[PDB]
Amino acid sequence: LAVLPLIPLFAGTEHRAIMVDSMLHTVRGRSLTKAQRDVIEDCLMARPSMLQHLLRRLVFDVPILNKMPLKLLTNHYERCWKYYCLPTGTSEEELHLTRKLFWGIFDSLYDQELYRMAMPCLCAIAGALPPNFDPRPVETLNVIIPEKLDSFINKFAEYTHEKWAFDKIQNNWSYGENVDEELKTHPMLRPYKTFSEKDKEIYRWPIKESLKAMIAWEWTIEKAREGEYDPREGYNPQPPDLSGVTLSRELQAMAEQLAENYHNTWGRKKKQELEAKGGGTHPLLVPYDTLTAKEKARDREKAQELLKFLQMNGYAVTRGYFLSTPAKVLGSGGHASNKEKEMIFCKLAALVRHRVSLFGTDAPLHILARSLDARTVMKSGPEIVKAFFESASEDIEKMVENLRLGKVSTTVALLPVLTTLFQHIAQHQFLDDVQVSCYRTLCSIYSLGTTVEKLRPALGECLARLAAAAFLEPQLNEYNACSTLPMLCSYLPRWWERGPEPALPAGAPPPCTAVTSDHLNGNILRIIVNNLGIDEATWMKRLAVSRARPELLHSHFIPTIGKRAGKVVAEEEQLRLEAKAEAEEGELLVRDECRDLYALYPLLIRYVDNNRAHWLPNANAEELFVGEIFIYWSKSHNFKREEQNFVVQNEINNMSFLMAKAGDAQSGGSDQTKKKRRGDRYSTLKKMLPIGLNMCAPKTRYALKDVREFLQNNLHLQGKVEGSPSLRWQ
């Protein structure tokens, strides 16, 4: 019947406490899993904070988890931690302490992997923050307080009588023979000096048990700083303002912990009392972290009263976010222990911790940079394996994550690259994983592009290995490493090589051309025009592969470098792609009564269309108010090739293995300089073009249905309109 609910707010939060109690019964069985679904979906529905108190009970339950059903509760608490993290982007820091307790669960150790996944999610929620009861009260009566403190206990007990009396005076209580509640009088409302010492002990006993609990925990309590509504019938105490005292977070943790002591002590006595009666339970008989903070407050007010009375007396009193990133540094120490394992079942926990680590990297202060250095250290321990292994692949994704940590903003790590360079010399002799380390080093070099030189010279030696003779990926990695006038003259030699079109050597020099794109940071712009000639050479290669795609990335680097004069010859090249696509569509007409082999040519032509995207200069078209419009006619012809049939789907197949709209701007030119503004005032040819679009429904004859060249521009606008009709499906 609890499945039916799945289909003010505080009462509903109490019902959440009740469903959580049923989960405590679950902490029949499959049915109890359905009740877990009830609490889970109830958590999905959703105020949230009371649910985080119930998730504090589920946090202590998570501590209990490392029983498996309680881990399932931790999983629902994890998806809830993710939804709440979405709400997040108070007790949340305590929830982060629950995450550190989940790290303790990792310390405790299949199902553990999924539990590590839910722990990865709760840890992600803590990262959003960073942007069968078993009481154990400490032995106290065996503890011996020093006698000098006892005279102070006389004073705090005196204060306790001052407060117990003053609070009765707040309700106008006064001295009397007997406890008549209606009479508003109580017998004990008499001055603290009147007490026999044993009568003072009635106040003292919990207090002394508290100080003995402090000494058992070896908390320091020592001399330091110097110490410091009508009046009613009866004794009239005027107690010092302890409430205005403000405990430090150390001492606030101390108050939370002494309150935890009153909780476990009164709770243990309550449990032994119920065992004496054969009785059931109490609402407070739950672990102290499980408690709503207001439930904690009932003793927290007392422990705070004690520690604040101490701070008012000025005694030193001691136990004896970015800090979570420091806990990640402790995780780096545990990673050093994992390196000690690397010198040779906890290692599987190290792998789950590696996944949690990459996930922590996704979440995003010098200490974090220290953690980046520790990441370089674990990267070195992985480098020892370079020259389960799937876990090492997880460590590799964690290495690209380390590059992301480099993207967030000692030098010894660079020396590991210098060792890496020597390994590249072994590649001259012919360990692909070391090349993958070179790839993560390349992405990390891009992280350097977001913002020891001798090792870079060793990388120049790796460029010499690139000139020494699969390898194209190493060339792209080198181009990423690039982020030198002899290299510029060598780039001129690469331009001479561009004149030459052997092609694989041009792939080898392509990385050098991308390095020239790095050199853009003058003469470098005209050199970028020579690089556009290199793009003309790559197009010469495109007349009939993936290295040309990395070279297309270099064409995007030319887009950074983007002059019009090269775009006229580029217009001739795009026209070659258009005549080629038309010949291929004519081959499809031959198929009607072939093109799939040419679809790869359509893919390289699409890379040329990306090169046209690099040309995106619409302001130059505004200046035209010119051949760019004819290029628009060419791209429109390519759109007509898209309108044909399956060949574009074959280009989608080329996309699975791995434009025209800007031309519409050129169509505005067909309407027309200032004359176009006169057309804005008109509110020219565009209506006739719409008539041509009406003709398109049934094509140069439609232009003849109408200055014939303007009708042809209306026809390109008509095919563009039918292309927009194709766009209507999207």
Partner: protein, 386 residues
């Protein structure tokens, strides 16, 4: 007049020149037309401890050494101009006994340096800023005395050291402000935060010479909004539309379309009633921020847009398409601008000649209509009143 006063001509004491302004003002009359402006900006400097806190004598002696080297730097500051060793208590004479080593100096006039340097370290104890012993404690032919300091040009100073030090110079300038409170205007009554930078050059050269002398000592130290709604008559809700937001000062603009229904009390776009983006950050802004585009550099005109039929809101930056897609029409829509206290908008509406650069490049191509194609009259506007 006989009356105790000072002339307002002397009110030019801080740094600002004496011009005239129309008070507050939602609309300055700029050259291309009426820039929207505002909403305006605006105290007495005070001494602060520092002095209640006290450095340990072991450090304060090393501070006496740093003060000695700094006094030698003052000797570099003076003696090249024309000065010499030996007694003569006047600046005009071009001779002064204290142009040298601390032991040689009078042991009251040297305190004008050394003890004051202590205050700097006292101030280091005041900020709570970290200031531990990072390192163990450690040539021109000048006329007369020739001091020979180990070079202060070692490690370059951390920017945090320069900032905290400028705070220190401001603090001492404040205690000096109390010193001139005992002296109706004075040359530097004004706090260091608001006075001409050429005057700042002295206090900054002092704080930085002191920080450098500490660097040679091995020491180191580290630590409402105006709206512009369009008139409700003008609420377009039928087909494509457009407007050009020329912009001056870079800043907290929240330019964009918003419904006539909107309540002014909310800053723009927190409510369902607005669709706008910030003038810096570049984030688009509705029901709280999302990332969207580059902040425009100063002078980089906005180009706001609204598709209808296929309802959409598009943003541009000088024709650079960058938004609030798939919006429902409700009532709507009006152009809306926003200004943080200093910023200056310029939301032109129609008159195609007034548009340039940013208009023809994109908006005209997409069939969008500027407002004034419908409007002979200037469009009216509604700034919020404080």
């Amino acid at each position: 007049p006989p009356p105790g006063y000072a002339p307002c001509h002397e009110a030019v004491l801080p740094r600002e020149r004496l011009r005239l302004e129309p008070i507050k003002e939602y609309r300055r009359e700029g050259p291309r037309g009426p820039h929207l402006v505002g909403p305006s900006r605006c105290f007495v400097p005070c001494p602060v401890d520092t002095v209640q806190i006290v450095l340990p004598p072991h450090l304060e002696r090393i501070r006496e050494k740093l003060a000695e080297n700094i006094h030698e730097l003052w000797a570099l500051t003076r003696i090249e101009q024309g000065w010499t060793y030996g007694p003569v208590r006047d600046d005009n004479k071009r001779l002064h006994p204290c142009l040298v080593n601390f032991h040689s100096l009078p042991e009251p006039e040297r305190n004008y340096n050394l003890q004051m340097s202590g205050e700097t370290l006292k101030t280091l104890l005041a900020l709570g800023c970290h200031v531990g012993m990072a390192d163990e404690k450690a040539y021109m032919m000048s006329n007369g005395y020739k001091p020979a300091p180990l070079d202060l040009s070692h490690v370059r100073l951390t920017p945090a050291q320069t900032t905290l030090v400028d705070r220190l110079a401001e603090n001492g300038h404040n205690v000096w402000a109390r010193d001139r409170v005992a002296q109706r205007r004075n040359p530097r009554l004004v706090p260091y935060r608001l006075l001409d930078e050429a005057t700042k050059r002295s206090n900054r050269d002092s704080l930085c010479q002191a920080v450098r002398t500490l660097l040679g000592y091995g020491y180191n130290i580290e630590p409402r909004v105006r709206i512009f709604r369009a008139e409700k008559s003008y609420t377009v809700q039928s087909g494509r539309w457009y407007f050009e937001f020329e912009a001056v000062t870079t800043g907290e603009m929240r330019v964009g379309w918003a419904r006539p229904e909107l309540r002014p009390d909310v800053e723009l776009g927190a409510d369902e009633l607005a669709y706008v983006f910030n003038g810096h950050r570049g984030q688009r802004w509705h029901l709280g921020s999302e990332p969207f585009g580059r902040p425009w550099q100063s002078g980089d005109v906005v180009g706001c847009m609204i598709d209808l039929t296929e309802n959409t809101i598009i943003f541009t930056l000088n024709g650079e398409v960058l938004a609030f897609r798939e919006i429902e029409i409700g009532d709507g829509f009006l152009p809306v601008c926003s200004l943080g206290p200093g910023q200056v908008g310029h939301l032109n509406l129609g008159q195609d000649v007034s548009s340039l650069r940013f208009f023809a490049i994109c908006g005209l191509q997409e069939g969008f209509e500027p407002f004034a194609i419908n409007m002979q009259r200037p469009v009216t506007t509604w700034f919020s009143k404080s």
